[PDB]
């Protein structure tokens, strides 16, 4: 269901990483499979060639945490007006305090050791349930 349309209509796009994360752009191909593309360092930009009706999302390349693009989950290149590329503005979401704490704890403790942490069993399960594109594709469907 969530897949790019095979329009064959070029649409130039600027990916702009206004986050402090290393960004992984992910293209959803014509069968819905996530295809990763070269990463963007914090604060950097790239002019790229894409197509109308194509679907993109953006993640932290290291942890796969979710990121927003023009304030939403998904970005679809539209018709270029007067030769101008489309701006894909990639930013941090406002994470819940809990998801933000999970990010930091994950960054400090190797998954082998999540069970050694003195916390309720439901939080060990929250730590293990990493962010992941497949899970979000099912959710967004």
């Amino acid at each position: 269901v969530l897949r790019s349309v095979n329009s064959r209509e070029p649409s130039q796009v600027i990916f702009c990483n206004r986050s402090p994360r290393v960004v992984l752009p992910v293209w959803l191909n014509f069968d819905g499979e996530p295809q990763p593309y070269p990463t963007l360092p914090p604060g950097t930009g790239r002019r790229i060639h894409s197509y109308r009706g194509h679907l993109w999302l953006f993640r932290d390349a290291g942890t796969h945490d979710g990121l927003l693009v023009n304030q939403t989950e998904l970005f679809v290149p539209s018709l270029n007006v007067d030769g101008q590329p489309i701006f894909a503005n990639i930013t941090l979401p406002v994470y819940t305090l809990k998801e933000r704490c999970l990010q930091v704890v994950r960054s400090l403790v190797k998954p082998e050791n999540y069970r050694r942490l003195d916390i309720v069993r439901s939080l060990y399960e929250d730590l293990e349930d990493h962010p992941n594109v497949q899970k979000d594709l099912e959710r967004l469907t």
């Binding site: 402090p20 930013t91 406002v94 809990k98 704490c101 999970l102 930091v104 400090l108």
Partner: protein
């Protein structure tokens, strides 16, 4: 309109009521002081900073900074966040 959130070690944090309602658990504890027997001041002060941060940056076009959490308080902050559902 303000509410008072009191830490386990007796620090009294005064915050706007609507900021505190960020937390569903606090809303329920209010329905206007709340004592938190398990949340020490070095965790609760951060919780209050999160409320300010969320209210300010939710629905905002300006670039969003990372919310900072020192390694030393991360574990306790997580437990607090989970209890408070925020």
């Amino acid at each position: 309109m303000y509410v008072k959130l009191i830490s386990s070690d007796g620090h009294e944090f005064i915050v706007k009521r609507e900021h505190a309602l960020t937390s569903g658990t606090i809303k329920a504890m209010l329905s206007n002081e709340v004592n938190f027997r398990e949340i020490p001041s070095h965790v609760l002060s951060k919780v209050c900073m999160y409320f300010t941060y969320k209210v300010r940056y939710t629905n905002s076009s300006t670039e969003i900074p990372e919310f900072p959490i020192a390694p030393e308080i991360a574990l306790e902050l997580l437990m607090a966040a989970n209890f408070l559902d925020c």
